[PDB]
Amino acid sequence: DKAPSHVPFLLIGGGTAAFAAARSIRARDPGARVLIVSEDPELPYMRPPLSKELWFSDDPNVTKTLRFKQANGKERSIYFQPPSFYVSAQDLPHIENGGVAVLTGKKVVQLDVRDNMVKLNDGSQITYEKCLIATGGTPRSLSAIDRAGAEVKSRTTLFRKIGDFRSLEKISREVKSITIIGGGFLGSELACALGRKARALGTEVIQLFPEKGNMGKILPEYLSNWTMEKVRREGVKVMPNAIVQSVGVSSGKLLIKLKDGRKVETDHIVAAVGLEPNVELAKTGGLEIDSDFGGFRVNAELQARSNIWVAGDAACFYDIKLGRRRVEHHDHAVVSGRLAGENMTGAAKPYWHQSMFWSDLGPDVGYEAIGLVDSSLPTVGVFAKYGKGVIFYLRDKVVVGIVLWNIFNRMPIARKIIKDGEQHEDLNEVAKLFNIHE
Amino acid sequence: DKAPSHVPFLLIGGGTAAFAAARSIRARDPGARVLIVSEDPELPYMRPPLSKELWFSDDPNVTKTLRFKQANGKERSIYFQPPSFYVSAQDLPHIENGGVAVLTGKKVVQLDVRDNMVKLNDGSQITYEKCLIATGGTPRSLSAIDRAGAEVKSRTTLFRKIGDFRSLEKISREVKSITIIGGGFLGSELACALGRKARALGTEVIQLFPEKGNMGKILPEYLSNWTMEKVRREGVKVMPNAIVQSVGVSSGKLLIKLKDGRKVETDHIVAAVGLEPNVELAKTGGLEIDSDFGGFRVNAELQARSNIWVAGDAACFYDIKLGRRRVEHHDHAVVSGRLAGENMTGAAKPYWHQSMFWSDLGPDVGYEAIGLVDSSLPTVGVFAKYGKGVIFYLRDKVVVGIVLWNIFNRMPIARKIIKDGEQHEDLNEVAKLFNIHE
Ligand SMILES: Cc1cc2nc3c(=O)[nH]c(=O)nc-3n(C[C@H](O)[C@H](O)[C@H](O)COP(=O)(O)OP(=O)(O)OC[C@H]3O[C@@H](n4cnc5c(N)ncnc54)[C@H](O)[C@@H]3O)c2cc1C
Ligand SMILES: Cc1cc2nc3c(=O)[nH]c(=O)nc-3n(C[C@H](O)[C@H](O)[C@H](O)COP(=O)(O)OP(=O)(O)OC[C@H]3O[C@@H](n4cnc5c(N)ncnc54)[C@H](O)[C@@H]3O)c2cc1C
Numbered sequence A, B: 001d002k003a004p005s006h007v008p009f010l011l012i013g014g015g016t017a018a019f020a021a022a023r024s025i026r027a028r029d030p031g032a033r034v035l036i037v038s039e040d041p042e043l044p045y046m047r048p049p050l051s052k053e054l055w056f057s058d059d060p061n062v063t064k065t066l067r068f069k070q071a072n073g074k075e076r077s078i079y080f081q082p083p084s085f086y087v088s089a090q091d092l093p094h095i096e097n098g099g100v101a102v103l104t105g106k107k108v109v110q111l112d113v114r115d116n117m118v119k120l121n122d123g124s125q126i127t128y129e130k131c132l133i134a135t136g137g138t139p140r141s142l143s144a145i146d147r148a149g150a151e152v153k154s155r156t157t158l159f160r161k162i163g164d165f166r167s168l169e170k171i172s173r174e175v176k177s178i179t180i181i182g183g184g185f186l187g188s189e190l191a192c193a194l195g196r197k198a199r200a201l202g203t204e205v206i207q208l209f210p211e212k213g214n215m216g217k218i219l220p221e222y223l224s225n226w227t228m229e230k231v232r233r234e235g236v237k238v239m240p241n242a243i244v245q246s247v248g249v250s251s252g253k254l255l256i257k258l259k260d261g262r263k264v265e266t267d268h269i270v271a272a273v274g275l276e277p278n279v280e281l282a283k284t285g286g287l288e289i290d291s292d293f294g295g296f297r298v299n300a301e302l303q304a305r306s307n308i309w310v311a312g313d314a315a316c317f318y319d320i321k322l323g324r325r326r327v328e329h330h331d332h333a334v335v336s337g338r339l340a341g342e343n344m345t346g347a348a349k350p351y352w353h354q355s356m357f358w359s360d361l362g363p364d365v366g367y368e369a370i371g372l373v374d375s376s377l378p379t380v381g382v383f384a385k386y387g388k389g390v391i392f393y394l395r396d397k398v399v400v401g402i403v404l405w406n407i408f409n410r411m412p413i414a415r416k417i418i419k420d421g422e423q424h425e426d427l428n429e430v431a432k433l434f435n436i437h438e
Helices: A016-028 A143-147 A150-154 A162-172 A185-201 A221-233 A281-285 A330-343 A411-420 A427-434 B016-028 B143-147 B150-154 B162-172 B185-199 B221-233 B281-285 B330-343 B411-420 B427-432
Strands: A006-012 A033-038 A067-069 A075-077 A099-104 A108-112 A117-120 A125-133 A137-139 A156-158 A177-181 A204-208 A237-239 A244-250 A253-258 A263-266 A268-271 A275-277 A303-305 A308-310 A315-319 A323-326 A356-360 A366-371 A379-384 A388-395 A398-405 B006-012 B033-038 B067-069 B075-077 B099-104 B108-112 B117-120 B125-133 B137-139 B156-158 B177-181 B204-208 B237-239 B244-250 B253-258 B263-266 B268-271 B275-277 B303-305 B308-310 B315-319 B323-325 B356-360 B366-371 B379-384 B388-395 B398-405
Touching: A006 A016, A016 A033, A016 A099, A016 A125, A016 A330, A108 A281, A125 A330, A143 A150, A143 A244, A150 A156, A150 A244, A156 A162, A162 A177, A162 A185, A177 A185, A177 A253, A177 A263, A185 A204, A185 A221, A185 A356, A204 A263, A221 A237, A253 A268, A308 A330, A330 A356, A366 A411, A379 A427, A388 A427, A398 A411, A398 A427, A411 A427, B006 B016, B016 B033, B016 B099, B016 B125, B016 B330, B033 B125, B108 B281, B125 B330, B143 B150, B143 B244, B150 B156, B150 B244, B156 B162, B162 B177, B162 B185, B162 B268, B177 B185, B177 B253, B177 B263, B185 B204, B185 B221, B185 B356, B204 B263, B221 B237, B253 B268, B308 B315, B308 B330, B330 B356, B356 B411, B366 B411, B379 B427, B388 B427, B398 B411
Parallel strands: A006 A033, A006 A125, A033 A099, A125 A308, A156 A268, A177 A204, A177 A268, A204 A237, B006 B033, B006 B125, B033 B099, B125 B308, B156 B268, B177 B204, B177 B268, B204 B237
Antiparallel strands: A067 A075, A108 A117, A117 A125, A137 A275, A244 A253, A253 A263, A303 A308, A315 A323, A356 A366, A366 A398, A379 A388, A388 A398, B067 B075, B108 B117, B117 B125, B137 B275, B244 B253, B253 B263, B303 B308, B315 B323, B356 B366, B366 B398, B379 B388, B388 B398
């Protein structure tokens, strides 16, 4: 309840990276006292289920329980730990053997790097010995929607939190037409999710984006096209090559006008058009932000200053093997958050273990990716029963990124390929490492 | 001298930044053991005298003694400390209360960050606890000269080291014409030095550069032009707007041909056209280079990795007040080197004290500078008795750089102006702080 005046380990933001760092610290410093300061009233929880498993649950009380069944059939909660796992912030300095506390509903509004101090929105001040910035990011919006009136904004969801899942799940049961703007994995996952729900009600789900196919920036054109067909088969009207010119309300309906002259009538909009790193604290903290990738600029060890690290979506870090990056993946927040916790306890380790990404777009599509995955890089695809396959992303004749298409339990192989940096003469032989033959 | 297997503090490079760090480390830890590895045969020495005082010495043995009198008339050596200040590398781990050693004539060729180890050109391996990279930079040459024959290269000086001063000084007494290429402070300082020698000796000194006038990139056009006139008054033939097309030999002499119709014939060429940061070790070390400014990319505390720092000309650092920069100034090497040393002894403080710059172009021109000094920025100059004046460099209606023209003992005032960063209603009133009125 009441924030202590001083804490050894202070973690800013109560998300995935923060929780991984808290567990990492406690593992290496058993009696450590870690304080997470989270503006969100919720305790740390994982987000991937918010766009997937929580929508495919048979339990009608899922919106209340926030529980789901994993791939192996085991049921669990999206929260990393139950409330009993944590200690209260007030008892954190006094409790024997320390623990992990979460100060929910409180925002760090000022970072005093000189005096190792943070100021909260309620005027409280907390001094620290080692600080992790794990603020993640805010979902971006459209300028066309920003310029629109207040009703348009109130009928637009920026999907990221538990509150967005509950509000949107209720909307899906109240309106007849939901439009998703954005072709990325998130927008495509929400389209498949709302798509399955729409079938029970006979409602409409629309997805439009500027690219020529789903994940146009990520997957090569041919696979992006195939994926778009699978999204359509999930009960989605996909409108590629769509750039939003303006948005307004006409007779109660939302009217989306595209630059190509087309117009779309809908009841509600979901905007999935990228993430904005939360770097407000860089101003008072005098911390550097990366102008190319956004976010806090940190080195290979995720360190910004003597006792300040950054992990998760907010951390623009230097990859020794792949260059400066900023990754927005669940496993990355775990890996980078875990790494930060180790470095905050003297590990002095650099980012080395490459984190992975995954996405599920209906039952027939499951993606796993790792490394530099971008459609503008040269690509070589090897497939077998359309069906499954691997896509290698090349730079300087070396594989720097891999996308696995309906191939599971083989990420270590992909990680080793990127690691060794070997110049392969025939990627067909390399595809056999992923059980792709013929 | 032989290198130990281990040393607590390892400084790569034996220049100004390295010495300032060694002095700083020892000041903080009077028992520290510091090893400087220098590819140069010389002990650490300051460079500004190589283009100024050493050429105006009243001692005809200056080229051998390398001693000179400062502005206050106090004689001293170009070396930071005499050999008695240092100990041998072999005895460094065994001498009680440690000391500072300089491994001369050895080049670190490999940096193994993982194992905190370096490899020398002779195969020796040295492990460290904390490491500073102070490798400075190599003088840049001209493509036109790179294309010329070996004889042309043999008669071109890349002025930077003690050997270049001795070689060029010997030449000035053996040839009839020397040509300096480059309009910066270095080229201009050398022009004034050789020009004075040419006065009471009967020889020619030529300076040519593509800019409209000396320090075209630094000073405003009107002040650059005024400075060019006084360099000429020192006995120099200044040829602005000169772009070299080729360099060849003609009857034993060097014939420079500019892109325009002009042609210059001289006996010797001195090239002073910028510096190339020495970042060879970034490859094996897995260290990040700055593609914009060059050099190693470090944070505000001059840190690159957990136990690696960078200082001096080779350090691209984050200036909390002015942004990311890389400065190539003597005082910067001292300030950043000693700040590095402090941070290598647990200080953990950012670059906050702004370093200054100076240049002497004859007896009637004394420049001092601080902050972001760039002719492409908007400037406001205030002058009194042409005489003296101050040049304010503005960004966002705030002073970010100051050049003082024949105004001394007032750098703390210029530093304070840049520190406060307040929008001034009238810069004339600010100029009064520098004793400029009417
Ligand atoms: C709906 C959804 C589905 C996803 N699905 C997948 C998937 O299938 N696969 C995959 O690999 N990745 C997926 N991701 C990405 C993954 O969830 C993110 O990379 C991960 O959540 C990043 O965690 P984080 O801790 O870095 O940031 P966050 O989880 O955003 O944590 C930051 C927290 O700090 C708080 N905060 C911010 N500023 C302050 C402040 N000043 N003071 C206090 N608190 C502050 C924020 O409110 C927030 O609660 C998904 C993301 C979303 C949103
Ligand atoms: C002639 C001259 C005049 C100048 N006059 C002025 C002036 O009036 N005012 C001013 O402000 N600045 C002046 N400067 C600039 C100032 O001298 C520099 O900013 C300063 O020398 C930078 O010091 P440093 O230690 O960073 O680099 P350096 O002095 O270049 O030190 C680097 C050293 O490390 C060595 N080294 C490099 N790589 C390795 C390796 N792998 N292993 C081992 N050793 C290595 C190099 O050989 C060199 O000896 C002048 C410079 C010159 C050359």
